[PDB]
Amino acid sequence: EIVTEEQGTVVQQQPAPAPTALATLATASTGKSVEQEWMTFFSY
Amino acid sequence: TEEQGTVVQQQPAPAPTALATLATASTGKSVEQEWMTFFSYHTSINWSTVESQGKILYSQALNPSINPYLDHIAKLYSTWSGGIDVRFTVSGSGVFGGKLAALLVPPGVEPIESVSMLQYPHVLFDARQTEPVIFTIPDIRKTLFHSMDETDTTKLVIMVYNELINPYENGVENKTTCSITVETRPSADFTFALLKPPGSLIKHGSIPSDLIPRNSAHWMGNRWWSTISGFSVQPRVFQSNRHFDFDSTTTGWSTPYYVPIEIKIQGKVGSNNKWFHVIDTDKALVPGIPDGWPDTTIPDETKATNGNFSYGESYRAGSTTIKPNENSTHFKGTYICGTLSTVEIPENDEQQIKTEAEKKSQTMYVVTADFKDTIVKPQHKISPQKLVVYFDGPEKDLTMSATLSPLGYTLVDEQPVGSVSSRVVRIATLPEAFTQGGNYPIFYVNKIKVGYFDRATTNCYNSQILMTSQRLAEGNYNLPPDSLAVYRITDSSSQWFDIGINHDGFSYVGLSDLPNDLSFPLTSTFMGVQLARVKLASKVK
Amino acid sequence: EIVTEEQGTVVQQQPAPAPTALATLATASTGKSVEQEWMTFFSY
Amino acid sequence: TEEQGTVVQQQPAPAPTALATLATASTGKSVEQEWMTFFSY
Questions:
Q1: Where are the alpha helices (DSSP H) in B14-55?
Q2: Which chains neighbour A (Cβ–Cβ under 8 Å, 3 or more pairs)?
Q3: Inter-chain residue contact C14 with A5, CB threshold 8 Å
Q4: Which one, of C10, C29, A30, lies nearest residue B189 by Cα?
Q5: TM segments (chains A, C)?
Q6: Cβ(B264)–Cβ(B399) under 8 Å?
């Protein structure tokens, strides 16, 4: 059959934490807010 | 609180928002980071019915590099965190049989090609897959985030569970293959952190993912400029000149490039010989030694007598034997170098030299050794004093400057160039690499023009590919001294084998001997970093 | 299997915009109205 | 009333307060002058 761009069966595996919680700890330390930060400052 | 600078009002104003709308309507813009809405080619895997249980067909660690877009963007940042989905699309025949096991190896653990790895939680997909399998690699870490230099992350491994099998296949020694394409898509929780000041370095060091060119067509040697044509597995590899390590250090006297050798000779009255001394040189790395001065020396001792090429009939193409005694050539193990010489006519006193100055230029034969006016002794420890040139040089007190460019080599025997410690020139020490645990070191081979023979050529060893020497020289790379920068080489056939680069700069292979039948139009791809203690992978017949 | 004259599964492509938008832009600049325009005017 | 100097906006911002929280959670910070909560030789 036909397979699109994100198509595909996703399998789950034993060693596997909480993606979200980890993400938060990162942005917490990082300070991430906007995805394209180079749009918020002037570059030489 | 306050932004530096004052906003002024310009007349031509961007005021319209509709313009944007129009743009959007005709382009169909939705999301801002499109690479997150689709899988993109990463690598391909050819699963063969010869590859047995336990073999690893794929092993990558979570890193921006496993994705085209992710990677190109990472160059802008200094921090990343999050996982990435890896989608495998197996495409074989519905009549085949076989399973493939997937497993996630936590950070701090190096996987090995053993079924032991399966005494750990693992899922498996079959050879006759219908819909793609997506494995999402979690980002297990003990730090709020990752530093662009970090490599020790979760590793995805694909091992052969049950050997692929084809019924319709003949019983005769043959083999069928089942192709599998690997793509990636950054998971939702994936993100780049702080921007990195363009031009800045990575304190701990950039990952060595570009030390070997993608096409073997751009593989020049760090010893001879000719492009690589083969490899040679040796229980010990060594070299010093133009060989750089990950610290960017070099025990040599030349840069990672090939440039003309500006030299300065001096002749003296009454000299029945033709060997000369080098008194000075312009462009030079190590003070006194000319940048690019050949790395090989003469074989044995011999009287400094004028002579020409001369090889017995033991060198006539057709004889599988060569007696090194027939070779009467005195300037053996010498590097042929085209030249453009000039003479410094002394002040107005006696222009008896203006005669030797107007003479046409000769091609000098360079080498490195000790020069006792009567006999030339082979010296493998270079110094501004052991620089020796040989040709039809003037027999009158003089000072001549020349600019030469190595083009060939005075053949000595069947053995390849620089395949022996003793004949390898060095200054302080001589870098080396020995076989370590199933991983043998290699020499990159390329052809070099020879002596008086026809358009013939002999083999020349090289410790690094010119580029590795360049990158490693001008770059800020890094990797644990107990690891290897692994790359996978694929020939223009179904053959391939991994190459690991040592911190010292030498390359290894997981075989005790590489094939000859290698269809040379080659292609290399970075695999990642592995403990040296693990046997480099390969699939060769 | 028998395939008719218009038979076929339509698959949607990732990089594709909304037709209706561009569509009208055309109709608007072009003034398109009927189809066999030659039905609406006498020709020499 | 006025503080000498002008505050400008830098990009890498300290904005996160959670960082502090994490610090605090793993160190167990309570009081600011710890030497006041115990006798010392």
A1: 18-27
A2: B, C, D
A3: yes
A4: A30
A5: none
A6: yes
Which one, of B272, B336, B277, lies nearest residue B305 by Cα? B272
Q: How far apart are CA B187 and CA B344, in angstroms?
A: 72
The two three-digit tokens of residue B59, written as one number: 């092993």
Please give the Cα distance from B287 to B253 (Å, whole number).
9
- Chain B touched by A33 (CB under 8 Å): no
- B410 Cβ neighbours under 8 A, 6+ residues apart: B309, B329, B331, B332, B333, B334, B335, B336, B365, B450, B451
Q: Do residues B237 and B506 make contact, with C-beta atoms less than 8 angstroms apart?
A: yes
Resolution (A): 3.2
Q: Are D12 and B6 in contact (CB under 8 A)?
A: no
Smallest Cβ–Cβ distance between A28 and the set B33, B144, B195 belongs to B144
Size of chain A in residues: 44
Contact criterion met (CB < 8 Å) for A2 and C9: yes
**How many angstroms separate the CA atoms of B205 and B88, rounded?**
31
What's D6's DSSP letter? -
Asked if C14 is an interface residue toward chain B (Cβ–Cβ < 8 A), one would say: yes
Using an 8 Å CB-CB cutoff, list chain D residues near A31: 12-16
Q: List, as one string, the DSSP characters of C16-39.
A: ---HHHHHHHHHHHH----S-GGG
For the record, the structure tokens of B409 come out as 């080599």
> How crowded is residue B500: how many other Cβ atoms within 10 Å of its Cβ?
25
Nearest chain B residue to A7, by CA: B132
Cβ–Cβ gap D22/A29 under 8 Å: yes
CB contacts of B3 in chain D (<8 Å) are 8-9
Residues A19, B185: C-beta atoms closer than 8 Å: no
Interchain contact, A28 vs D15, CB within 8 Å: no
Q: Residue D31 corresponds to which amino acid?
A: V
Domains recognised in chain B with CATH numbers: 1-199 (2.60.120.20), 200-541 (no CATH)
